């Protein structure tokens, strides 16, 4: 549902307003060519062009796939990669391996084969192209055409930038809408903060905290911002719509209540890797609660409520007794000093929570008042059932430890420890971050699983940054803006708005 004239705002400007973006945008092959979605496909574009550049990509893709094989299916598809590019003789042959670099993979598969029998050879391209490569793209007509992309990118957002459709989640400090993009016709959820109650709570911080934190992770497995910015009477953040409900609705409404242990399983290692995501910035959660984890329409879920999220420094500890009652951490209930034990805490609860139908210190039945949750919180151990495995009794009494030194993830390994942990031991990650793995439960489409200062000025300056330069590049390419509007010339020559002879 893109707007009538949909080519003509996403219309690219002439190569020679770019110039501004041009010196300044730092160079980093890391950011260019892979991070961001439109420039990583414009360089794989640009490898197209020329015949030694094309293996290489082809290669990657390759070992890409391999990466996500079943184990049972690795060794076909090894030599399947071997007996394409790794031989001498082949149309599509890898050259900057080293001959002692192909033998020594040719070593490997004589072996048992793993997951990782690719990655010296990938690396090794990687750094080929870095160099020689790379530095051509760039004086090349597509990165041209990225600058392009990214001076549309940074164009100014409004209200006008979106259309509402329906509240959705009114309750908390303000409302969450329905927005969407209007020349792409992208969905997302308008988080309204409404600008009054933010300075009357004196909370501007937190919103910033929120925004940021937000904008710095991006995971398939925590709600994405994509835009912020300021209208009358309210600061908007649009974030990823998840229409297909939140876990405590499936747990209770739709469950036993409780799922069956793989149910759960499912759930626990994405929420393991949305966990792990927010970790990389020592960002703690602190708000872990089935409310909290919700649905999309294919029936993967997503870390929602940030609204208590904080950046620990590193090398750092914090405070605050914050959270929901029977979901608190205990160092969290005594006030002291944390890191991100809180969330492997959290993620003891719901595994607990989903397969069990009830909290671990509190029943679904019971009517007891928070002094004696939080004291079974604190002093009380839990009891299992023949629901759990002993591989799910170990993990939820090793997150539920009380003691966050001893805490399963709270060590320097963290969330590789409790990835590793038997309780994961039918779990490729690999093949879940890859968005391989069916989500168990499919929410049906048509479901409804249900004042003139100027010191707020700086603050807005701050929140109203605007668009996020990796789900913007996504949107673009979800919607097929990106395949209509990156058009070239017939024939490989530059078209008007790339050529400087003519504006
Ligand atoms: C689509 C959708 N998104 C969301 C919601 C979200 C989202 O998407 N991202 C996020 C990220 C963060 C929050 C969050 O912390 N807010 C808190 C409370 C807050 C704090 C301050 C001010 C306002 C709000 C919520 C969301 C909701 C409910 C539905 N609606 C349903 O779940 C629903 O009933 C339904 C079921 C089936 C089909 C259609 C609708």
Same mark, same amino acid.
């Given at each position: 549902?893109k707007? /009538?004239?949909? $080519?003509e705002?996403?219309?690219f400007?002439?190569? &020679?307003?770019? %110039?501004? @973006? +041009?010196?300044?945008?730092?160079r980093d092959?890391?950011?260019?060519?892979?991070?961001?979605?439109?420039?990583?496909?414009?360089?794989?574009?640009?490898?197209?062009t020329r015949?030694?550049l094309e293996?290489?990509?082809?290669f990657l893709?390759?070992?890409?796939?391999?990466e996500?094989?079943?184990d049972?299916?690795?060794?076909?598809?090894?030599?399947?990669?071997?007996?394409?590019?790794?031989?001498p003789?082949?149309?599509?042959?890898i050259?900057?391996?080293?001959?002692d670099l192909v033998s020594?993979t040719?070593?490997?598969?004589?072996? /048992?084969?793993? $997951?990782?029998?690719f990655?010296?050879?990938?690396? &090794?391209?990687? %750094?080929? @192209? +870095?160099?020689?490569p790379?530095?051509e793209?760039l004086?090349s007509?597509?990165?041209?055409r990225?600058?392009?992309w990214?001076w549309?990118?940074?164009?100014?957002?409004?209200?006008?930038?979106?259309?509402?459709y329906?509240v959705?989640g009114?309750?908390?400090?303000?409302?969450?809408?329905?927005?969407?993009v209007?020349a792409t016709?992208?969905?997302?959820?308008?988080?309204?903060?409404?600008?009054?109650?933010?300075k009357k709570?004196?909370g501007?911080?937190?919103?910033?905290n929120?925004?940021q934190i937000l904008?710095?992770?991006?995971?398939?497995?925590?709600?994405?911002?994509?835009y912020a910015?300021?209208?009358?009477?309210?600061?908007? @953040?649009v974030?990823?719509?998840?229409?297909?409900?939140?876990?405590?609705?499936?747990?209770?409404?739709?469950?036993?209540?409780?799922?069956?242990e793989?149910?759960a399983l499912?759930?626990?290692?994405?929420?393991?890797?949305?966990?792990?995501?927010l970790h990389?910035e020592?960002?703690?959660?602190?708000?872990?609660?089935?409310?909290?984890?919700?649905?999309?329409?294919?029936?993967?879920?997503?870390?929602?409520?940030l609204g208590l999220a904080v950046?620990?420094?590193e090398?750092?500890?914090?405070?605050?007794?914050?959270?929901?009652?029977?979901?608190m951490?205990?160092?969290?209930?005594?006030?002291?000093?944390?890191?991100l034990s809180?969330?492997?805490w959290?993620?003891?609860?719901?595994?607990?929570?989903?397969?069990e139908?009830?909290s671990?210190?509190?029943g679904?039945?019971?009517?007891?008042?928070?002094?004696?949750?939080?004291?079974?919180?604190?002093?009380?151990?839990?009891v299992?059932?023949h629901?759990f495995?002993?591989?799910?009794?170990?993990?939820?009494?090793?997150?539920?430890?009380?003691?966050?030194?001893?805490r399963?993830?709270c060590?320097?390994?963290?969330?590789?420890?409790?990835?590793?942990?038997?309780?994961?031991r039918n779990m490729?990650?690999?093949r879940?971050e890859?968005?391989?793995?069916?989500?168990?439960?499919?929410?049906?489409?048509?479901?409804?699983?249900?004042?003139?200062?100027?010191?707020?000025?700086?603050?807005?300056?701050?929140?109203?940054?605007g668009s996020?330069?990796?789900?913007?590049q996504?949107?673009?390419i979800?919607?097929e803006?990106?395949?209509?509007?990156?058009?070239?010339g017939?024939?490989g020559?530059?078209?008007?708005?790339?050529?400087?002879?003519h504006p």
């Open positions: 549902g707007s /009538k004239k949909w $080519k705002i996403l219309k400007p002439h190569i &020679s307003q770019c %110039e501004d @973006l +041009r010196r300044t945008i730092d092959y890391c950011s260019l060519c892979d991070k961001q979605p439109i420039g990583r496909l414009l360089f794989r574009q640009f490898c197209e015949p030694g293996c290489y990509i082809q893709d390759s070992v890409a796939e391999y996500v094989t079943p049972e299916k690795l060794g076909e598809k090894g030599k399947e990669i071997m007996t394409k590019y790794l031989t003789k082949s149309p599509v042959f050259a900057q391996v080293g001959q020594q040719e070593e490997k598969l004589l072996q /048992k084969p793993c $997951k990782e029998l990655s010296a050879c990938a690396q &090794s391209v990687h %750094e080929y @192209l +870095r160099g020689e790379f530095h793209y004086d007509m597509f990165f041209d990225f600058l392009q990214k549309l990118e940074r164009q100014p957002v409004t209200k006008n930038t979106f259309r509402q329906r959705l009114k309750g908390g400090f303000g409302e969450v809408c329905a927005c969407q209007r016709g992208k969905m997302y959820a308008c988080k309204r903060l409404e600008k009054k109650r933010i709570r004196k501007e911080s937190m919103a910033l929120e925004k904008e710095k992770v991006n995971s398939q497995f925590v709600v994405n911002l994509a910015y300021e209208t009358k009477d309210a600061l908007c @953040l974030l990823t719509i998840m229409n297909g409900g939140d876990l405590k609705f499936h747990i209770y409404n739709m469950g036993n209540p409780g799922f069956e793989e149910r499912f759930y626990a290692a994405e929420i393991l890797c949305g966990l792990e995501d990389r020592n960002t703690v959660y602190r708000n872990l609660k089935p409310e909290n984890i919700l649905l999309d329409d294919y029936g993967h879920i997503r870390i929602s409520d950046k620990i420094p090398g750092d500890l914090i405070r605050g007794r914050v959270g929901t009652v029977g979901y951490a205990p160092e969290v209930l005594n006030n002291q000093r944390y890191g809180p969330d492997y959290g993620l003891g609860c719901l595994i607990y929570e989903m397969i139908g009830q671990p210190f509190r679904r039945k019971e009517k007891v008042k928070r002094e004696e949750v939080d004291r079974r919180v604190l002093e009380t151990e839990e299992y059932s629901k495995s002993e591989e799910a009794k170990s993990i939820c009494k090793m997150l539920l430890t009380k003691d966050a030194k001893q399963l993830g060590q320097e390994e963290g969330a590789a420890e409790v990835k590793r942990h038997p309780f994961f490729n990650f690999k879940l890859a968005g391989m793995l069916d989500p168990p439960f499919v929410p049906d489409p048509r479901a409804v699983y249900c004042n003139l200062d100027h010191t707020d000025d700086d603050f807005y300056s701050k929140f109203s940054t996020v330069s990796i789900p913007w996504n949107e673009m979800e919607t803006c990106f395949k209509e509007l990156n058009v070239f017939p024939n020559t530059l078209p008007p708005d790339l050529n400087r002879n």
